[PDB]
């Protein structure tokens, strides 16, 4: 069995999807934002706008198959990233708020541009998925990407303990 998008159809490996929440009341899709002294928007964050599908995210399995297997690792990159970013792939860097989800200004190695994994959420007509962060075990997926709203309203994506993200993947019109 593989990952299913928010309409029942199999998630197409490499395709573009909007990562929206289970409950639309929780917010909108995932986009970018300029936090810190970033020269541009390099912080992956959720949209405060309940009607915003957000940026279409590209999901690329670790397998070169047509579909993405259930426990497969996946790279997640913005279809239309910001100019300043070297590559369009989400990545995980350390920070005070813990591991944070950000875009990089210089190229990224495979071991960094391939650290996420989707996990099904049991009882739901529609397939919902939590987002895991897998790290270097000299791989271990046992960290859940969640939200952390910073003092400026930014609902950043950062590994958290409570309230992990629960997403539905809606195919984005190419
Ligand atoms: Ni803060």
Q: Domain with 67 in it: what CATH number?
A: 2.80.10.50
Residue 129 host element (H or E) = strand 129-135
Q: What is the distance in angstroms between the CA of the first residue and the CA of the last residue of the chain?
A: 25
Number of domains the chain contains? 1
Ligand 1 centroid vs 75 CA: distance in angstroms? 27
β-pair type (16-21, 167-171):
antiparallel
In angstroms, the CA 47 to CA 51 distance is 9
Structure tokens at 39: 């020269």
Resolution (A): 2.9
User: Which experimental technique did the depositors report for determining this structure?
Assistant: X-ray
Cα atoms in the Cβ-side hemisphere of radius 13 Å centred on 80: 7
Query: What single-letter DSSP state applies at residue 90?
Result: -
In angstroms, the CA 70 to CA 31 distance is 25
Ligand 1 centroid vs 37 CA: distance in angstroms? 13
Ligand 1 centroid vs 151 CA: distance in angstroms? 5
Task: Print the domain residue range for 97.
Answer: 1-174
Ligand 1 centroid vs 139 CA: distance in angstroms? 30
Helix (H, G, I), strand (E, B) or coil at 14: coil
Ligand 1 centroid vs 6 CA: distance in angstroms? 33
Ligand 1 centroid vs 169 CA: distance in angstroms? 29
Ligand 1 centroid vs 38 CA: distance in angstroms? 15
β-pair type (45-46, 30-31):
antiparallel
Which residues lie below 8 Å from residue 57, measured CB to CB, with a gap of 6+?
A: 16, 17, 18, 19, 30, 76, 77, 78, 79, 90, 172
Which pairs with CB-CB distance under 8 Å and at least 24 residues apart come from 80-83? Answer: 80/55, 80/56, 81/32, 82/32, 82/40, 82/41, 82/42, 83/40
């Amino acid at each position: 069995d593989d990952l299913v998008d928010a309409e029942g159809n199999l998630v197409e490996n490499g395709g573009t999807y909007y990562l929206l929440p289970h409950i639309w009341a929780h917010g909108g899709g995932i986009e970018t934002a300029k936090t810190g002294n970033e020269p541009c928007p390099l912080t992956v964050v959720r949209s405060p706008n309940e009607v915003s599908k957000g940026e279409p995210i590209r999901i690329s399995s670790q397998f070169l198959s047509l579909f993405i297997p259930r426990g497969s690792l996946v790279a997640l990159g913005f279809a239309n990233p910001p100019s300043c970013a070297a590559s369009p792939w989400f990545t995980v860097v350390d920070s005070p708020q813990g591991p944070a989800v950000k875009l990089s200004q210089q190229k990224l190695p495979e071991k960094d541009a391939l650290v996420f994994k989707f996990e099904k959420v049991s009882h739901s007509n529609i397939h919902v998925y939590k987002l895991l962060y897998c790290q270097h075990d000299e791989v271990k997926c046992d960290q859940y990407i969640g939200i952390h709203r910073d003092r400026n309203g930014n609902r950043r994506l950062v590994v958290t303990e409570e309230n992990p993200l629960e997403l539905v993947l809606l195919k984005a019109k190419s």
